[PDB]
From a paper:
EccC, the motor subunit of T7SS, is essential to assemble a stable membrane complex for the secretion process. It contains a two-pass transmembrane domain, an unknown function domain (DUF), and three Fts-SpoIIIE-like ATPase domains (ATPase1, ATPase2, and ATPase3). In this study, we have provided high-resolution crystal structures of ATPase3 domains of EccC proteins from Mtb, all in complex with ATP. In our structures, ATP and a magnesium ion bind to the nucleotide-binding site in a similar manner.
To explain structure-function differences amongst EccC-ATPase3 domains, the crystal structures of Mtb ATPase3 from ESX-2, -3, -5 were determined at 2.20 Å, 1.97 Å and 2.00 Å resolution, respectively. Though the sequence identities are only 20%~30% amongst the four ATPase3 domains, their atomic structures can be superimposed and have r.m.s.d. values in the range 0.99~2.02 Å by comparing Cɑ atom pairs. Here, our structural data showed that the recognition pocket in each EccC-ATPase3 is different. The signal binding pocket of MtEccC3-ATPase3 is much wider than MtEccCb1-ATPase3; the pocket of MtEccC5-ATPase3 is much flatter while MtEccC2-ATPase3 has a shallow recognition pocket. The different shapes and compositions of signal recognition pockets further imply that different T7SS subtypes could specifically recognize individual substrates.
Residue numbers in the entry: 1060 to 1313
The structure:
Amino acid sequence: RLLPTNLAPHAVGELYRGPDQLVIGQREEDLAPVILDLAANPLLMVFGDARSGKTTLLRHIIRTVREHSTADRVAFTVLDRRLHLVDEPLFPDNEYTANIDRIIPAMLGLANLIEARRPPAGMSAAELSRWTFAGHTHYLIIDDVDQVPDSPAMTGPYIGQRPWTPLIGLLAQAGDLGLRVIVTGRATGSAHLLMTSPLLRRFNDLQATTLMLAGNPADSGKIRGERFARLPAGRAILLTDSDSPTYVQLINPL
Ligand SMILES: Nc1ncnc2c1ncn2[C@@H]1O[C@H](COP(=O)(O)OP(=O)(O)OP(=O)(O)O)[C@@H](O)[C@H]1O
Ligand SMILES: [Mg+2]
């Protein structure tokens, strides 16, 4: 079927189908809504070369989660060095930073928060009793994650420390501890990053949902056997747990 080139946020029915169930576009087969289930798969990585739609998809998610949530149930943490998401409102007191030097402590403190939700040792088949957690589902949004140096810090109070270290051990249980993580990066270089970045290698080892926006069919490498294609803005290959790769068009907000 013929996908659109500019998909309006009202052409797809209800955008919010329940907590963590977000319509993000239409699929090529039948133009049916594409529904991101962040409770089932809390991790999403989006790869695309210049101006293909990474940040716009982040904006769409933030706006859709925010419009149908209350501040005492949902919190965002947004890391955005290029500042293209300053526009988008969060909830009160929510961390938005573009400062490469605030990332290390911000992640340490987010990690301490999610870590405190884990169940005690000594349980064994008594936790699958709605153990859950008391408070916010926390959406961690990292635009252009491939542009944050992931090497030990050379200067400042956190010398020798790396930005993503406290996050890694959380990713496997993010769905039980009220954590979602959404990141974006260029298409070129992405396959190598999937192998060398501790953060993105863990995303891939955990089969994170992947959106492959436009990229180079030669250089950008293979993700789960798929090459990038030269696509218009917002057109992506969607890789999930349950279906084979799917062409989709993402909603263009505003
Ligand atoms: N889902 C969409 N549908 C139609 N057009 C889009 C879509 N997403 C992005 N665009 C077009 O591409 C432009 C750039 O989008 P965006 O800033 O999200 O790209 P990016 O991949 O984040 O760019 P950069 O590589 O600079 O970070 C938008 O201004 C719009 O013109
Ligand atoms: Mg961008």
